[PDB]
Amino acid sequence: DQTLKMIKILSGEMAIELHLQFLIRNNNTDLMILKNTKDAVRNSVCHTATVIANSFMHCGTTSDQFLRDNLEWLARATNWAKFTATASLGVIHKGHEKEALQLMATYLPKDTSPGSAYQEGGGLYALGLIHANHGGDIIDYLLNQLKNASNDIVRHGGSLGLGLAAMGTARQDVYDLLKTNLYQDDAVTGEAAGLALGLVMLGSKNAQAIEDMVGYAQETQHEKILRGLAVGIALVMYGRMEEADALIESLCRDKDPILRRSGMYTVAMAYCGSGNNKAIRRLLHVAVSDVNDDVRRAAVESLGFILFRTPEQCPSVVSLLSESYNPHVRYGAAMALGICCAGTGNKEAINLLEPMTNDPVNYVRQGALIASALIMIQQTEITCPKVNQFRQLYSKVINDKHDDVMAKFGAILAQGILDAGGHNVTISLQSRTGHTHMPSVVGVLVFTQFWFWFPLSHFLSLAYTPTCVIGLNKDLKMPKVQYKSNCKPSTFAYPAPLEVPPEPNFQLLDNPARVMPAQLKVLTMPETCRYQPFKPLSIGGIIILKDT
Amino acid sequence: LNAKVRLLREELQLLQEQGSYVGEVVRAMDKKKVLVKVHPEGKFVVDVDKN
Amino acid sequence: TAEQVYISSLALLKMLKHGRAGVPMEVMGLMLGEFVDDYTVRVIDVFAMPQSVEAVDPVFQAKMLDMLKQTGRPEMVVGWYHSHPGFGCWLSGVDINTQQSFEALSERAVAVVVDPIQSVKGKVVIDAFRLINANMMVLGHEPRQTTSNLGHLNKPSIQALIHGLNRHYYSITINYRKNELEQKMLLNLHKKSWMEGLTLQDYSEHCKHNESVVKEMLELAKNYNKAVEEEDKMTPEQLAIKNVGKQDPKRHLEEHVDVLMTSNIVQCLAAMLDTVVFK
Amino acid sequence: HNMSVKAMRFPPKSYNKDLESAEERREREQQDLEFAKEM
Amino acid sequence: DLYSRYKKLQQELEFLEVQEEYIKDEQKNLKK
Numbered sequence A: 001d002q003t004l005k006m007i008k009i010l011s012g013e014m015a016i017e018l019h020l021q022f023l024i025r026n027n028n029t030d031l032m033i034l035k036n037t038k039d040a041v042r043n044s045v046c047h048t049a050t051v052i053a054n055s056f057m058h059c060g061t062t063s064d065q066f067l068r069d070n071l072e073w074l075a076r077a078t079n080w081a082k083f084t085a086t087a088s089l090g091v092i093h094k095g096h097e098k099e100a101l102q103l104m105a106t107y108l109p110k111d112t113s114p115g116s117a118y119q120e121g122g123g124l125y126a127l128g129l130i131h132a133n134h135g136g137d138i139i140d141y142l143l144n145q146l147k148n149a150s151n152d153i154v155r156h157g158g159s160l161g162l163g164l165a166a167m168g169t170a171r172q173d174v175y176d177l178l179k180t181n182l183y184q185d186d187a188v189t190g191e192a193a194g195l196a197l198g199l200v201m202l203g204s205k206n207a208q209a210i211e212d213m214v215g216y217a218q219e220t221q222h223e224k225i226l227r228g229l230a231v232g233i234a235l236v237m238y239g240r241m242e243e244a245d246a247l248i249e250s251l252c253r254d255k256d257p258i259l260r261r262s263g264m265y266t267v268a269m270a271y272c273g274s275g276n277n278k279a280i281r282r283l284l285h286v287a288v289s290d291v292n293d294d295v296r297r298a299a300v301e302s303l304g305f306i307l308f309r310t311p312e313q314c315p316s317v318v319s320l321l322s323e324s325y326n327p328h329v330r331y332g333a334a335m336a337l338g339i340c341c342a343g344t345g346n347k348e349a350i351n352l353l354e355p356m357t358n359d360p361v362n363y364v365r366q367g368a369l370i371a372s373a374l375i376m377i378q379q380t381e382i383t384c385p386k387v388n389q390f391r392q393l394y395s396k397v398i399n400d401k402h403d404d405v406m407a408k409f410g411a412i413l414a415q416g417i418l419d420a421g422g423h424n425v426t427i428s429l430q431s432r433t434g435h436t437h438m439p440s441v442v443g444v445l446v447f448t449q450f451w452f453w454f455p456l457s458h459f460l461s462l463a464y465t466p467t468c469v470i471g472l473n474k475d476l477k478m479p480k481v482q483y484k485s486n487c488k489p490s491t492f493a494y495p496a497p498l499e500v501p502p503e504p505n506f507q508l509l510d511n512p513a514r515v516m517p518a519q520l521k522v523l524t525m526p527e528t529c530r531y532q533p534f535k536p537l538s539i540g541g542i543i544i545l546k547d548t
Numbered sequence B: 001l002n003a004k005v006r007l008l009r010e011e012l013q014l015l016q017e018q019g020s021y022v023g024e025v026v027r028a029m030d031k032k033k034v035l036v037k038v039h040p041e042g043k044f045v046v047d048v049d050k051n
Numbered sequence C: 001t002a003e004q005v006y007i008s009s010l011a012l013l014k015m016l017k018h019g020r021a022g023v024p025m026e027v028m029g030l031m032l033g034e035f036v037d038d039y040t041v042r043v044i045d046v047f048a049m050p051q052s053v054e055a056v057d058p059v060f061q062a063k064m065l066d067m068l069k070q071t072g073r074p075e076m077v078v079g080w081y082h083s084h085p086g087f088g089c090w091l092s093g094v095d096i097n098t099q100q101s102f103e104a105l106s107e108r109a110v111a112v113v114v115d116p117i118q119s120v121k122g123k124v125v126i127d128a129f130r131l132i133n134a135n136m137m138v139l140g141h142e143p144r145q146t147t148s149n150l151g152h153l154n155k156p157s158i159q160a161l162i163h164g165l166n167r168h169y170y171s172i173t174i175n176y177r178k179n180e181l182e183q184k185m186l187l188n189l190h191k192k193s194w195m196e197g198l199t200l201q202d203y204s205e206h207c208k209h210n211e212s213v214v215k216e217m218l219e220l221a222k223n224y225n226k227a228v229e230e231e232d233k234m235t236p237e238q239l240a241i242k243n244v245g246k247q248d249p250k251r252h253l254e255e256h257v258d259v260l261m262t263s264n265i266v267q268c269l270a271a272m273l274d275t276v277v278f279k
Numbered sequence D: 001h002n003m004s005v006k007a008m009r010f011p012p013k014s015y016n017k018d019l020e021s022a023e024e025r026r027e028r029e030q031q032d033l034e035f036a037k038e039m
Numbered sequence E: 001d002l003y004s005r006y007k008k009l010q011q012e013l014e015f016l017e018v019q020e021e022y023i024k025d026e027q028k029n030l031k032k
Helices: A003-008 A015-025 A032-037 A046-057 A081-092 A124-131 A137-147 A157-163 A170-181 A190-200 A207-216 A225-236 A243-253 A259-269 A277-289 A293-305 A314-321 A327-340 A347-353 A364-377 A387-398 A405-418 A438-447 A519-520 B002-014 C009-021 C058-070 C093-105 C149-151 C157-162 C180-186 C204-230 C254-271 D002-009 D021-037 E006-030
Strands: A426-429 A463-465 A467-472 A531-533 A541-547 B026-027 B033-037 B043-049 C028-034 C042-048 C076-083 C111-114 C125-130
Touching: A015 A032, A015 A463, A015 A467, A015 C076, A032 A046, A032 A387, A032 A405, A046 A081, A046 A405, A081 A157, A081 A277, A081 A467, A124 A137, A124 A157, A137 A157, A137 A170, A157 A170, A157 A190, A170 A190, A190 A207, A207 A225, A225 A259, A225 A438, A225 C058, A243 A259, A259 A277, A277 A293, A293 A314, A293 A327, A314 A327, A327 A364, A347 A364, A364 A387, A364 A405, A364 C149, A364 D002, A387 A405, C009 C042, C009 C076, C009 C111, C028 C058, C042 C093, C076 C093, C093 C111, C149 C157, D002 E006
Parallel strands: A467 A541, C076 C111
Antiparallel strands: A426 A463, A531 A541, B026 B033, B033 B043, C028 C042, C028 C076, C111 C125
């Protein structure tokens, strides 16, 4: 009703359940790629790589087979990978309401309470992942669960999930409890506390919080809490375009390298995508004049965030930076290409990252691999002919025992990237309204921080967006309309798993049907059917179909 | 200039590689094998590189 | 395991001094600071003991700590060091059969090894191992969650992999927060007197030095004339296989003439920087 | 002198890029080093 | 065709100018 209209326009529900319905009807995944990646059995990294990859490819689909196939291998890695697994369980069941608390019934801290407290802490991390950008009873539940707690090994996941859920809300009390969580002066709670304050105060300009954290940033000694505040300073400023200039000047002129890295992240984050030459002058320049490698890498990373409007100039400038003497600068160049063109495959980016995988430095190979994964997304090999070439190169490097374990770790997470949501959700920080998806931006920002915390870069589920036209005539009733296409149906090509030992363009598509954004111009509008789109059909998502 | 410094920055790497023996050929045989003596030493069959 | 790198400037200076002093033996000593937290330990003071490799008597370090208690701030024994001259900065069997005794004394394994020889005037070579261990054959160390202490650093040298235990660790980095006061205090080590900065050297050796350089420029001119005169089409690659002899055309030029100019011009400039104010 | 110095660099383009090593050669050298680590 | 071409020409002009100002200071740093 018009009384119920406010819920229909403001609660954000029906988008979530119809995305869920689309992914659970369109579940074009692959059971066997996990079996291929299972070959490199080791006790160090493979468990982590697999548990992030299968969560990446099966996000929100609630498919319990990749963890239900085995249990002894599931718990073979301990004390950090069980935490990663109970983290990944949330991404598997993200965008849900009911089967969140109830499926973790085995994983309550008070139901079993074994000697391991890490698996029982990341359940709250999973809960925060599921209900990200969705306040309510989740907020109160997490607040009450953080009212009393053990030592902070259980409080990492709870703190990060609480920051994930109440991120845009800017609730006062959660910030108040994070304040005393930060003032514990403890290393283990440093990652717990420094992140989520920037989470909750995103764009709030709560200047008291900035003053408190920058005062805190000058006496503590824990590296972890320095990193937490370093990303918090970035995540407190957003899109002001003029206000953090004193802030970025203060954080850039200081001698502290981690705080200079924070300053580079601030000038990235308060200047989302803007083509401000004046910013890029000082930013790029101190990308060279600096001395510490980490802040140099952050400075060259910030270029990818700052060029959404016309991302085709970034290859031209950073092609030279890819040939720098410094492997850190080359790695930053690789990820900068990966994140600037986070969308449609561009031939220049693929060509420039083609030799980047062959450098004899492990981490620049990591950057090249992940950049290659993100540039080629949902591509049916006709957009760029390199899709299967990178797939077979990935398949070659996963089963080689000679390459470094970091590089193959990046390769398995690349397979996680390519098949995300059954190739139905993709990485696109841009709306069709000329606006940048804020949760995608913050998710891909946190995703860059896998140097120092592997499950922290688990925060990428906020970046996946489905690419599917959805049809709905009334509030709830699904219609039944199937239209055609005009171009080559090989643009509709799927991976089509082989396991081996005259062309119709009228591809009929139902209401929850996937489509590439580039294919949005070549769809057939429903004309002979009883339905007809009230709005002209050039945008994705869900569109009104008036019935005749 | 980048090229130059890169070469020099990799110079101390390549110089880490050990030296290479010298030898005197006598004759070769089939399947790309060659008989070469070292100077106060014996005679080795050596497989030739593809270049 | 991103918890390494505890270096401080005065410590490294004392360690290069102590290693360079007695070179033909493996010297050793103790290094003390504060265990500020689990991921980081700060060092403030470092000392050595005489020996004639052998562990020091506890009496020596006991009285050393006893007088350092009132000597400024209190100290905590945070570890120790040794050298390995002309080596790959690697742990020995003698080192490892006392490292676990040190671990029994204090769990934080400080296995600093320093070398003055590979530490060249530009680049310095350090390691500080963290109890390279082989207790169990299906586990490594407890933290494996970041690539900063695992992939960011350079991979170890081949010989350190050979004669060292292959379960290697550690990430030595200067990590002393770049103390600006002592940085500005040290700065130039080759500043002279201000009143020395206005000196003139002398005019006589200036002129005979010029005379000395003119004859070598004449000879360089002769060589240059011959080398332009040959102008062979033998290709510069084959020109560079026969340049190993005495032939050095244009291979000096600059090395005297700017040396000429920096001889002349400063002698010119200081000739006029002391005139209009001195009467 | 300055005019000659400036004019020296204006023609010689088409210098491609830096050629450090080959990926196959580097991989083979690393594999030989790792295999001879016990040796 | 009209108008917007002038704006994109001027846009790549200051973009190119940013690269020009960059190339000097990076050359100065890389020499030393």
